[model samples]
Target chain A: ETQSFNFDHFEENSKELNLQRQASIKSNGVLELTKLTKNGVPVWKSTGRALYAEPIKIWDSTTGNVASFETRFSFNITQPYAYPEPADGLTFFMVPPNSPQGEDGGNLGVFKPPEGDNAFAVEFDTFQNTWDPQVPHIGIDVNSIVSSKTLHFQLENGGVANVVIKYDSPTKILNVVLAFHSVGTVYTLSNIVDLKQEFPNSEWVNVGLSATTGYQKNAVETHEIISWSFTSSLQE
Target chain B: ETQSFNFDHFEENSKELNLQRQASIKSNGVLELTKLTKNGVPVWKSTGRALYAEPIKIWDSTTGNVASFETRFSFNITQPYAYPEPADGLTFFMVPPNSPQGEDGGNLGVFKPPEGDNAFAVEFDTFQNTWDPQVPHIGIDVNSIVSSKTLHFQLENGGVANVVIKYDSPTKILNVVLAFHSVGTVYTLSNIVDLKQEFPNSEWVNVGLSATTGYQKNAVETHEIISWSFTSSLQE
Candidate 1:
């Protein structure tokens, strides 16, 4: 059987959704994941984490199958015109099927150093720690936080960016495309990866977004999702 | 017969080449297309124009055929840090065989608006005009100046962008991928195109790059191509 879901309404408004956890229908046209988890104090009050409540199968063993899919969402990260730097940024990640919430802070709440186990993230990073390239950029990070393929970029200091992530199993390719809304341009990046090559032990994984800003933060940066949709598999 | 060509050595240098017209080995490893056509005289002093000294065939009549090909070249565009706004852009284009060096200015020497007749350009544009989308972006245009697809982009501010343009005949797909050299990232975009659907009369075409800066211009913009190669046929 093929599984598919498109989120047009949820939280309180309601349509039968196969939703599993953390996401809340906070307002009309908005999914507030972390509640902008602020440290009650500057260091911890703002550290927040959220995950799409369900597991999206990308591969299966019993059926000995690989699923090709495409997922897209429109998101906005606003800094309230205050802190010019949004230190720790965000990520669109794939974690083990039952992976729990990850660590907070520079971890971006996805995965920390040397311990990603079986996860990968497409990171939109704003901070530059000692090990990082020290520039705002986009990267593909597998298991660990060390990015593999990276490109420097500038996010809208106060607006939104639309993103599309797709995986074509037959071709063993994973692609990402991003652009500011109402903007006439798109920037795309891709990698050809075999899920088995990265996670031999897992047959299914979860897809979600995670964001965190450590001490030197953007003060009030919000990661908001306006719309999202994904098809778990497609038949050629 | 299928035709294929490759250029690895240049500028008065020695190596077998399949080259055609104005391009020349100006230096040990360089090809000087237009001496920046310095007007002996800004605005009019002289912009510049370049056409690869070759014409590549992408289609033929006898087999009533369309040949698919992938062309990759490592090129760089640099202008003395003289103009803040580079007022012009560069393009990977297709023109009728023996197409004349076109009108300069905003035309980027590709073709003039309203009369490009038998040409098409996939532009990596950086200027903003009343008619443009006002951001540095990439686009696909045919016969005329209106583009069908445009995406914002950054091409090594003062460096190189590696590009790969491919056509898949069976699926009628034309794809373009560009990534800043030295920057570990790739951006790809594509269009569903049927060559026959666009040019009903032509069976063959030429491929190359054309760049220009109009009257109120940027002092210098240099486009340097290091290695170039293309093969015009792919089996499904």
Candidate 2:
């Protein structure tokens, strides 16, 4: 059996995506996950999340079978010309359906309080926190904000960042590929994760994009999603 | 048919590795590729290189058949407690047998002059230049210092960094894996390169490690190679 969803662009008040917190579709046809400011000033301690309207089957509990999935998303991070460096970052996360959004900052609105959010996140982090690497890097998180593996890269303001994520159930390998438009460089990273082991109690999980802005120089970064597509298949 | 070499440790005046510039074997059996300082102060604009004593056949010039190679190297980078950040970085490089060493700083002692050095390098860059990514990263370089692909990670002062590089001739893929001892983090990156096309005139090439220390804050970084082993087989 297979399931799929695709959104080339976000219409005004789109029904395909479940927006939470400050997430909204703008007049320019972009999914604004988090806004940089209110009007002329900055917004601090703000968070936003956008999840798919329906939950997708992640694994079968009886047979302990995992699903293979492929997803592609296009996003852009824009920083105000005179503002301080970008804040927080964005993440593509998978968690139990109806999970509550977490606080702002490095959590990326995906984690819940004192650990064990039962979530998997692929993060494109722009800010360097104490627990993070020394650079703006991509990280794969398992339940915790501390990533198991990270791949750092250069991130400039105002550029289209394209990402592709693929999980092979047979190998239990999750591969991520990232690239920037007009930048002739590509980055590939992978992680081995068994969904049957990580989420034994849940058969379905919600997939979403999350972003946050902390109280650092008053939120200079804007996170937006331009396009997204996802497909998943369960083994027979 | 295949050729192989292995060095578990660097002896005093080792015959296996031809040391150049400031490279030497310490009494602790470690291969010192670059010295951080002369005495207590920093050493500025310093460079070092160590090439294997014998050249290895990289491909068949007559048949244009490429060779598959696998190399594993263990290295450590150290910094003085009060010194500035680390300088430059280290590289595992391959070039024509008698290629001349380049200048210091970002060149890493492998590149020569105004382009077209005809070299393949996997660099562990600790310092960020204008052309480099914002943070410390691993880059795959062809002919020039500008990398074709890069994977960034955290680079602390003191840790054993283990690396494995494999080239599959049939697929023309060069894969690199890096990890830090006790960190439990692994980074995998790859690049597609055709050796027969990159170095058409050269059938035998030299393999080595190259490092440099620039004029920043004197020189607070020390590059050392702990162990290495390499094997290569020409495709029939």
Candidate 3:
């Protein structure tokens, strides 16, 4: 699920990363994997002593003109299982250089630092909690707080969905597009902001997925990365 | 139905007559009665025919304020009918004082003239024809030669419609109103002209009803008035 990029391959030094995965199981099971990261660390811990996995990392020191990130994943649930239960999903992240991956266990699988010095997470959370009504939705979690501004699109049972996120520094705009396979519907959302100025001189960044189970009561399910791509511009 | 008015009971040499009929049928249907001329001939006709009653008639005599003549009528059709079909009905005139009532048949039912003088008639037609396509409309025809100018409203189904013929001396201007009862919609169309100057010194104008079987077919149904009150004043 990992790809290699030579730091000095080209003069512009821009980079692209892609990851793909498919999962299917007969009984209660779990499948988790990571594609790549730059100057970041991945931490692993266990909950209910069920199952866990290590993170895949990719590092690129050279920066380029423009940066773009896109991911596409597909999953099929053959049989109904309390396994994976409801509210179990994945996250995509951009973290500061060299920041330690936070604690593990229960709902804390994808942890970030306290000051939120260099971290941003776009989470597709299914679980209903005090913060979310539990209806399926996507959110940008800044630091540890889920920003009040979020984009939510509905999904059908047993269907595939894709999400794409692109950020442009020149125009200071971030655009996101989510497409549902079963229904053939697409939703696009955007925002404007200068990320370079937001975090200033951030050293490392990580793009990955995280999943967890609360207790031994429910069956564990697997999450896969179908494909991921990223292109970045060097800071002048 | 016919009503009587005695001229001997009045002190004035000439009597003014005014009459009105309310809608009887909740849906599209015709309400008509016959009227006869008393001591004097009808100088003008003012009658109301409910929705879609086309080719209505009004004429002026040379005796009164010859400048122009005015006639008004109102009609109500409970349910509106489709255009190009015999929907809301029409009105007519019996001309040339003392002329025998002609055959009540086809579109000519409204034009059947009494003998003696050349029978002159004006018709307020609502349905569109080869000459016009605007549905729910009004048109005026003199004898056989059809004039190019006609009035029309955007009413598909007939509800209730009204018309007023105001002859300005030599210029006869016809004003029409197509109103829907259920929706309370009103459309006014005007300018069908020149009666006195057109026929000159014409006597006896009869008001009646004429409707067709379908859109293009000539009117098959007809009704006539035995008597009506009409008065005219000279322009000062």
Candidate 4:
């Protein structure tokens, strides 16, 4: 018996969490899925989401068992004007309860839902397109954006990234760790899939954090989320 | 006997340092005065500089003594696409060795120049224009970017900024200290002028670092410097 959700910072028009398009939560408490615009004219192909309103269940349909999770977050990706590079990146999805919010630059908003709908993500990619993997990587999406497994990270140009995700239903595996405090560097990735066959008929889902910036035309960047936490156990 | 320069990173096509216009030094070692552009398109009135090829004495016109410097750096200012805001910022200049590199955005390349050339920046400003100061500040400028003293910093989106600048010269004062490590916050500012009355005729000067991005149009940002150091004693 365990289920949790936390946020060390993010409170300024807070509604617990559920921000959608072009997100916000800034007042310094962080959590601006994609902010920064003052005198207008700087929004190109942008997309953002937040989610975490409620919908957790994950398995155990009459004791079939399966939920075992953990999550930790801390982000920051900036590219003020390094060119039309630094696009579409950052994710942590898990869709299912109302879904539908993908398609927009590299599909990091959790990929094109609506094919019987189902999703799962991890990505932290940083532009390379053509099926990615030419540099700044860290994938593991399912339900598409390619990436069945990827790793090759070292994004530190505006630093501060600290992620962690776990899901060990008796070693069904699905771990990940990434820390890039300025230059200390650290990374790890893993995956195995099989969450009851990726949500066969859903048992409750919805968990989020996303980002996007045009796929290329005027590419963009700046996705923050200072802190977060989550936990789960299943089979109540 | 002291007249120094140092770098803990920035090496990869480095020439002891001196990268103007779109500055560079990346390879992961860091120093991209303003980098990030692959498929082109994303320049926007940019301006960048990074100096240290030599020339620095700072007072001692035959026993009139003076020099007494100290510097330290570590930067990171991202803004991939928060909007068209985040323009013109970052500096640490001193000019007088070739000068004439100003005008691009809020005059941060070290301002105007050629007006009989004579500089002495410090700024770390972050968009505010019209004489700045409405949030995110820290100025000092001398040959004018306006700013004879300012202080109002608290920028922490892509975080990571650590600076220190000193000058004693028997207390002509000019100290600054800023540390915005993701949120730990710390800031201090001071000014007193009188560097032999602002380089009366230049005994030698050139201690740089600069950045800028249009004054408005697509306002951009991304000034990196990872590390730097300097020292002086004078009366050689």
Candidates' TM-scores?
0.52, 0.53, 0.35, 0.31
Top candidate, metric lDDT: 2
DockQ of each: 0.04, 0.02, 0.01, 0.01
Model 2: colliding residue pairs = none
TM-score of 3: 0.35
Query: Which should have the higher TM-score, number 1 or number 3?
Result: 1
Segments in model 3 whose C-alpha atoms lie over 4 Å from true places: A1-31, A34-85, A103-108, A112-117, A201-203, A219-221, A234-236, B1-236
The lDDT values for all models are 0.62, 0.80, 0.38, 0.77
Comparing 2 and 4 on DockQ, the stronger one? 2
State which candidate has the highest TM-score.
Answer: 2
Docking class of 3: incorrect
Candidate 1, residue B165: lDDT: 72
Ranking by DockQ: 1, 2, 3, 4
Q: Give Cα distance to truth, residue B88, candidate 4, Å.
A: 16
Candidate 1 contains a number of clashing pairs equal to 18
Error of 2 at A221 (Å): 0.3
Report the C-alpha lDDT of model 2 over A112-176, residue by residue, as the tens digit.
66875789999988777778996578899888888887889887668887787777687666777
Give one digit per residue, the lDDT tens place, for model 3 in A1-236.
23222211111112233222321221232233421111463222222111111222222225433333334333332213544554344566665545555443323355544654455656565544566644456666556635433566675555544565555455444545555545534444444544544444553355544544333333333344343434444343
Question: How large is the interface RMSD of each prediction?
Answer: 10.4, 13.1, 27.2, 22.3
